[model samples]
Target: KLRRFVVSPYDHKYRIWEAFLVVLVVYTAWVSPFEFGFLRKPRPPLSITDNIVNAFFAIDIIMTFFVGYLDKSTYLIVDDRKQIAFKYLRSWFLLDLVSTIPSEAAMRISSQSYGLFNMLRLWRLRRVGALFARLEKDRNFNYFWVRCAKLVCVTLFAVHCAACFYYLIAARNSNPAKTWIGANVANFLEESLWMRYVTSMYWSITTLTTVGYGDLHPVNTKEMIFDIFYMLFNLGLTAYLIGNMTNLVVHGTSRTRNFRDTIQAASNFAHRNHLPPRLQDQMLAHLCLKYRTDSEGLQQQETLDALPKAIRSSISHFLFYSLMDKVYLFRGVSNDLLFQLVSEMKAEYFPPKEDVILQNEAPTDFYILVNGTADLVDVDTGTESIVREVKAGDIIGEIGVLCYRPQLFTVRTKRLCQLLRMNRTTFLNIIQANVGDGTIIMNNLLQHLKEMNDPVMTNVLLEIENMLA
Candidate 1:
């Protein structure tokens, strides 16, 4: 609970923690400037609110050691005590330690000309920056571009606030223009509160964008050091924007290119072979079927194989049961047989106007339509006539495959279709693998053959009747 429930970014408590941190950041950004606003000395005992915020930071530092981090190579969380300790020590631990230390002691003891020990707290915003990435990645509440836009806007605003707050303090203490000119032509810090803000913001924007006009210069070592850090942050933000654009363009281009090339390849092959118009359509359809099922996304075999053996079995049982429930032929099929069926079955797609089975083709596969429609056309006469229409949840070519005969009619897709196919070899393997399960399926199969009044089963029954005579 301490590690995940409270510390994990995905949990409610962590979100609350982030909200509190953001409030703390806002508090520190503007309020701290007043301490150095007009040459005020560092107060040893800071306000109670600062103490509470520092305490939260100390607690967060402790939580960091307990929380597990992602080991990307293994794609798992590394939570072992030794690994956690080592990982926490190696990355960001030193910075967090520095940032969480109570600023009052450091400011009073360091004995610097200008108190800047409290500046370490600003580094905590690095974690806040990381939270933006985590929110978009873990939750997926919005699109990539939208998340990035929000991140960019928040970062720019936060940086601007930090700059406005700190520059005001720096300008009041050390006015370079006043020193350089030997007289104050313009002193933005001495101006009223609102004008000071406007002037400070103008300098902040110009500095952040790498546009140095030299009108407002950082004369002191402290402000120059800040300028150095500001430049580095500008580079980081620019790189992120470039990367996002590259990813968007490259990903879209790759898919579009592959799809276009595949289409061109299919068209060229048809012209090169001088194939008949119908044969060309069939070939193109076959290519589309293969591409859609294999190349478009994750394959069924890949998904099944990735799962644990027990989970795979459970999922397969449920999926096959649903499939059996859809088709009338599997009405009384046992769960054992249903599970066995899924083991041997593979999903396939049929593009519109594609032939699933050609007339007189030896039955090598049986197709069960999960969606869309197919036309059962008698093409043997050299003139086609639609014998029937096969709809979703219908079983076709099964009787021929079971009885080991040629298909009587060609089955062609009337529209885009998805089907689950069981190959003859896979079926034979299943039967040979488990005879008891095979017998159960065969008994149910006979009932379907009887329902269809298929000639193969009718002939076998007549032969049995004659033998009884």
Candidate 2:
């Protein structure tokens, strides 16, 4: 009772977090000069202000120790703090300390004089900069971006360093107002050694990488042509750099990430609604499947073998938006061409546990439920829903006319449900438009079926029957 009382019955961890955030804001504002807009600068804390801030931070850590003194599970509503989702806590706290110590130590020295302290404050922002992840927690996109930021920063820094070296070496003898080794310059060239160095670096970057900011330009006619050729070279190097990063970040990493995982996580965060289990399982199976001969399926077999049964419930909700918001839609087709589409149609919904658009209701549209669960029932069976239950992250209803049937089974919500529905006519159109695409998908599905163990095959077969019937 006392613990709950002090922390407030509502949620003590959040309260502790709020307190931590207050201190972070106060400290970051002190360090930010270029970032915080209206409030960026180290305001000389009145002789006592710096001391007070330092004391407050010490107390803050002490509080974290008390809560953290116990394993984090004792403090969290969710038990998975040990997982990557909550890892930022441990990492960011360390960053906070690194930034904090410098500020506090500087103030201690500055007690004698302001000038000595100011010099030490130079690197304080680096520490404060690390805390922006905490700020972006309001959205999952920002938080994930924060996780990926270090990789991006490193790569960007490498590119910049390479450009700097190239600029120095590439333009040592080039004249400012002269064309290459042939053309002449204006009275004095009008460009400086410092400007040359900076411009050369910029030119190397923009020309080699094709960024072409177009601020500082070449002087002569021949140099202008040279700049164009440089632009082409820049395009090639940009492609090379991007290709390497793609290979490194997406293809060469651990199972925790991959190219599809990038969009998958984004889709997971994108959809806000919960999902059904059946649908969720289908989505995961789809994502984990290897389609191409050279394609490495989802991740390591160990990872796939251990995927949490509950993850897809989140995925269905996520992938629904991705399909609707991202894919082009269509209808009506006997045969199809690649990328041809007939139309994109809208869908209807019901709160889960309700009948969410019945089967044989004219196949108004082939549907995919994004979130929540649904039971596929024989229409004649009425409420006797059993067999297939669509879970979150699952796709359903797209193959409505695969066997030329009017409809198969009634789809009823098992839980609150969200759906992405496409019209049958539109689906056929999309298929016919991209007819040649069928060979690849058909081949992949065949390969998927061939490898299936009975447990998985039984469920998949049941799902297809639900549609084809």
Candidate 3:
């Protein structure tokens, strides 16, 4: 359901509008403090600019009444104009209106309350805070940088506001000679604005950082009170900053720590059990390879499992559909059947010289090579010999799975191999669901067996076919 003149909150144009408002919010944040300190009386040109900025916020306030808001309970955009208006009215409409009013105009109406009215514009900073909150969750940007930038902006703004307010207090004091700035520089009010502002910032940062160098100490009771409160606030701010830094550092090093723990435990287990050096080396190599291949560990599977079945099915179909052409048993199979089969399969990576399927082991899963090469070694006797090399697009251990017998050859990787493995039970269930495709696959297997002229495998295939019938 769409309506003319009502704006969707998620619309690209509306998002761009929100982004534009954030820029205005930042301007308001910077200018509010600057105006409070420097321009006790509003100048014509800057006042006009401030009025223009106020107008944009005023427009946004009006626009908000027409813009749909997402309902947290249902996660649906409430597009009804009355609902949108009521939500805005109930939440932030009054604050937004107050913040958007031009302080110059407000001063004209009530000269005594102009200063307090001017401070109301700082409410706009909430929009910038909200923007950062949203960006932190957005995947398009790196979380670390977004979080770091947000903290930096907050710290800088706090310092800037405190500096400006401190200057304002000094400028308005009755005894100019007793004030921090006036005592340091004679005729401080007549000095260059840049120098005054820089001095204010130096004092503010030095105090905020608890590095009060004694060069600029508070001289009076009023400043002493302000300093007391600022110092207390800085204590909490410093703790917060340190806590966030520690959290980030811990998160950054967590992966390496986890990897080391896993390797250490594996090394200890091998040592205690007195495992053969070759077996120990293979275990170490596999752990290292697994760490490199998937730093997220099993979280990848967990993520995939979290998706809805239809989405997971579609993803499997898209990734494995073309690759299915290389799988001989699946060739000429119905797309529906292929989709079902691929959905049940999982891709696994093996390091070089690793045994994927050991000889004389009961078949549990069959693999299709997606990349790299594997050797089929016959180890029926005391020694092993490579019988054949299986390349990409070839299937391994399928005969064992299909015939319900032990694997005859050890499938070992010559290099790092990417294989799609399907569990025997799952594969059987899929074939059972698509009997026509199953018959075609059985035919394909029998044809390959005859081509190899292997009497043993040919008899096994015939026996399986009879059992199925």
Candidate 4:
């Protein structure tokens, strides 16, 4: 009983483990390539730090085996049993052991453990810090990670689709070695044993942008058919990606799309409809609740108020954690860097029920719900019908910050709410650090995101022609 109680999800050890995972994943990134990146260099084996790191891992592993959190005698504290398994798996204890220990043991060969020996050995040490939610039960954190992952995944998927379509066709008639081809087509020819991928890579990009320079053309009927598909494929796919990228730039962040649009359109329509102020409030509230649990009485809609302190505090923590824990989306972002990014959030608060945007409101103000929920009503609708709800996790209002048109929705709060807001300029600064900023994590993330996003893509592309025959 004491043991299970200690290991339970509510155990404080779980949080320690969570923090430990954060430190481990992020530190590995630092040692591997995320922080040092281009400046990364080889190291000597059997160093003090190596021993320290190995000792740390060995202890943690031992803890998991012997001191499981469920035990009341365990080192950590527990509050609930709900997330015990989640906490254990979340620590990524096994992976951490692999990244640190085996190599430490290998270094043990001849009684000499190579700590920082061959740089390639470090590949095994590329640690994925904490993909699991630091606080699994925390809804706000979950939403933040979810949104980040969704944006990255969708963008990657769309780009992949566009590239494939462009290359498949471009490879048929052009020396793909030079031109930009869609991704789908070039992949078809990648099976050549003697073919260097770099050779084909040049062709893939060349054909993709529709830059068919004609030095290379498909040699056979099969290749010819490939080229034909490339043209149409790039047309639709490329355009879609371009348009979507523009939208993100324009929207800034995607959290507030429905709310911003509803309010702005409704505001504009209100001018023509000659909506009274009271009616306008009612209208926005009614429409904004579509995708959320939101409603405001006629009085509630009219009054501008801030969220009560308790909810506000929750919202504040949510925003703070979201920016600080920039983990889920960036692949290998370090905790220290994430700390810096969180520091860079540049947060601001709005008055309660503030109309952050009105009809024609450009997507403005990437906001984290600090205190209250918002309503999104249609400016186009006669009664200003609600389009959706803007609750705590429902982030919206980002485009205006990035120079997009005014918000497209009307926004007003149902309850007093506060927003921990950041504009695009700052967000961009933080995320920019993401690609070049986290070289170690970014590289691995880029490498396997394909595997994570769609493992099927690579597997399906092989041995096409032989199969047709």
Between the candidate structures 2 and 4, which one is better when assessed by lDDT? 4
TM-score of each: 0.66, 0.25, 0.82, 0.30
Q: Per-model C-alpha lDDT, please?
A: 0.67, 0.47, 0.82, 0.51
lDDT of 3 by residue, 232-286 (tens): 9889998999999888889888778777988989889989898899878887987
- Give me the overall lDDT of model 3: 0.82
- What is candidate 3's TM-score against the reference? 0.82
lDDT score at residue 171, model 2, on the 0-100 scale: 39
Q: Please list the residue runs of candidate 2 whose C-alpha ends up more than 4 Å from where it truly belongs after superposition.
A: 1-59, 70-144, 151-469
Best candidate according to TM-score = 3
Model 2 lDDT tens row, 1-469? 3332123313666556655655555453333321111111235544356556556655654544333222355674332324322443655566445444534355465544333333333343443355554555656555445545644544444344444433322334365334331132242234553454454456555655556666545555545665666566556756765775676566545544545665566347545445665565555443433222114323333453565635533343343434433222222112223222212323334444456555665555666655667887765645653657767545555434443555656677765455655565666656565556655544444344456555744454566545546
Please estimate how well model 1 matches the true structure, expressed as its whole-model Cα lDDT.
0.67
The local distance difference test score of model 2 is 0.47
Q: Which candidate is the best by lDDT?
A: 3
Per-residue C-alpha lDDT of model 1 across residues 152-220, encoded as one tens digit per residue: 666566566655555554555554463311122355435665565555667778777668787876656
Tell me how far the alpha carbon of residue 223 in candidate 1 is from the true structure, in angstroms, after superposition: 10
